[PDB]
């Protein structure tokens with residue numbers, strides 16, 4: 001299971017942020033999209049699956065199950081879409097608050113937040129970042 | 142040196158594709174941008190540096206040295222910009238030709254091309270993909 005992810009959205013300044021979490025690591029990827037349309041979700045799944053091993057994507061609701069291009073991205077890349085599973089979305093938003101006045105565009109602040117989340121140590125000291133854990137779980141596999 | 146990348150652009154259907162190569166692995170990331178502006182290059186560097194260890198980015202010309210937001214992205218993420226160093230751009234374009242009629246948007250075909258490039262074996266058989274090599278070099282570090 002180095003290939004299990006959770007996909008959810010969150011909202012900030014009235015724009016949509018897609019969030020993929022690697023469950024076993026807490027590594028995250030995220031992007032501001034211009035609406036919820038299946039167009040962009042599909043594109044971000046394909047991007048994510050070109051980068052990392054993506055085998056199963058868990059979602060919490062039915063929106064991803066009613067989109068033709070997500071179905072086609074899933075199929076082209078060999079991703080199982082699968083129903084049933086947060087505050088990862090809440091801690092993301094704290095860091096977006098700590099950095100928001102360091103960049104003009106919200107989407108720059110989302111990427112600064114992802115950077116910090118991925119590279120920091122739990123507690124601030126010792127052990128691995130999310131970034132190290134995802135590589136260590138895939139390497140160890 | 143798990144953190145050395147090459148950054149270049151290539152062109153197709155009159156749109157710009159940014160290309161980051163992890164030199165020791167051949168792993169690639171790429172994105173269609175709406176012009177060459179330092180805005181998008183900076184954003185893609187920040188994205189790339191949130192995902193992987195990015196310490197030094199080599200470029201071949203002076204365009205990245207004259208952009209304020211690239212300078213600011215470099216500085217915020219701790220990336221050394223460094224002058225002096227392809228046909229990686231040419232093999233990318235072969236695969237974009239093999240897949241172009243499977244997606245409406247060129248940018249979907251660029252991501253299908255990156256997927257294949259990153260996950261395939263050299264020869265088609267045995268050894269590691271680019272995706273496995275980048276994780277193996279970072280893990281082994």
Ligand SMILES: Cc1ccc2occ(CC(=O)O)c2c1
Pocket residue numbers: 039040042043044046069072073076243244245246247249
């Ligand atoms: C098959 C596939 C996979 C991912 C995608 O992202 C966006 C699209 C739409 C398009 O350009 O054809 C798309 C298609």
Ligand SMILES: Cc1ccc2occ(CC(=O)O)c2c1
Pocket residue numbers: 102103104105106108180181183184185187210213214217
């Ligand atoms: C400091 C920094 C780093 C990466 C970036 O990408 C785009 C911008 C512009 C902006 O929104 O402030 C930007 C800034």
